[PDB]
Design a binder for this molecule. Sequence first.
Ligand SMILES: O=C1c2cccc3c(NCCO)ccc(c23)C(=O)N1c1cccc(Br)c1
Length: 559
Amino acid sequence: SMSYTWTGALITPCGPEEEKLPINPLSNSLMRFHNKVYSTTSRSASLRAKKVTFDRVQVLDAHYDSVLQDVKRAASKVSARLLTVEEACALTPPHSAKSRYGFGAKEVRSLSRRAVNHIRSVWEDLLEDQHTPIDTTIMAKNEVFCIDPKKPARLIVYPDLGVRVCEKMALYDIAQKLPKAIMGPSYGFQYSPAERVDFLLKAWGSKKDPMGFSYDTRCFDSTVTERDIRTEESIYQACSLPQEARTVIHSLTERLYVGGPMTNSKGQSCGYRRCRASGVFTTSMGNTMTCYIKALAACKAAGIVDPVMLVCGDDLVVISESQGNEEDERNLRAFTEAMTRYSAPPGDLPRPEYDLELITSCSSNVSVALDSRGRRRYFLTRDPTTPITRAAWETVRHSPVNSWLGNIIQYAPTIWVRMVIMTHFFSILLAQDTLNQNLNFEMYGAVYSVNPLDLPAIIERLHGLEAFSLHTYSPHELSRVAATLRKLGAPPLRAWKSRARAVRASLIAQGARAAICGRYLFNWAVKTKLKLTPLPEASRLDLSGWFTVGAGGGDIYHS
Ligand SMILES: O=C1c2cccc3c(NCCO)ccc(c23)C(=O)N1c1cccc(Br)c1
């Protein structure tokens, strides 16, 4: 069946859409080549529609069947419950898209009677009607990139806010337990950055002759079939659940997850979906489970030897024993053929990699540096082009969700975060006198709230004290950072050091928590380095809840 059909009505914008980065001294100081920066808009939505629209023809086999049987068996050990309305309301992000029934996220979070009564009506209707397709809106995402020597907007398909709160009531608890129960250490969202690094390193080290590859599924959401989605339901139903939950889960599956009508921002019928919805609660969990099942089966089909997989939604990395250079190539082609039969054909063809630093999982890779005691330390990093470009845009057009803050937390040990991002934004915070203000940010498909003054303890907790003293880094790493600074027209690293000396000084003179930020975050910037001791708050922080499966569209909030 076709992943989508289309009436010919356009994918329309809500309000205005800025395409280009403005020329402004506060962003220009970070990077000069503003003409290279663009935000996607609804103008390119028809180009994306063409790419995501195709027929799927899935053929399953015994390798698939046995993996699925193991998965359902594992799922049987899980017990889950319904959330109360109040609990689901608290999980709603403050800037979630408003309902068309006369309330928005603010009213959900405050438990306004209109919002709660509406949500109760939606829940009752899900108990009563297990079949009528539920309406969705289709929008073009506005996301910022640098031109690569312009990509079309991604599309997002989501139901009304009343429905989204109900999805959490039915499935949030399952989503906290099921992926780990069925995948164990292959479930990637359980790991903080350091934990991901440790898992990859140990997997790599466990092989005599390691070989790794990443598999890029072409438009994964579109390749998910109606049957894949019903199979996901059967995995949820293998858990021990209250009957009320079982009913609503089946209704959500039949009316929303397997497909439905799509409406544009103007209220015009736009198309019909028979694939994964990109903006539902289950998008991340479902993609993870289904990717895992297809991938592990394909490893068996291809003859991949002793696979260790890391799966994060549609993102897949597999580390195994090399069978020789020719044979590895043969085996990946066979892996690809099997994935293709399972309805997950490739974009980029997979290729065998024999150096861990060059393997990319979730646009990230492991690299190495030295700490202040001269010990080797490994850490997660990535190509800094997109983070810096988004930092520049968000400097002049503030976003409810601050990408730069999530990049600080996730990539704190990196040279590019420490020298450029931290320097740029702590300067801005001092200038606004808003150091002490909580800001929201995305992380693994969820939204969180952090006070910049707590960053030192947050970073020590996630990355260790070594995050404040890494040096020496690798040439791969430094080459990539240098190439990005040149491409964007950013000041060179030596200029960022000059700036950071001043930001550190200003932070220390503010005293209290600001001074801790100066001393710890910017110790790299001074000649006479301070001896950094463990921060007592760091040793008492519980940040496990930051690394969960998240939700389609990042539509979940923890506080
Ligand atoms: O402070 C610098 C630095 C300052 C100026 C230029 C460079 C540099 N430039 C050469 C080519 O871009 C390469 C690495 C570092 C660096 C470099 O690794 N460090 C550095 C040392 C310790 C911690 C941190 Br964070 C950065």
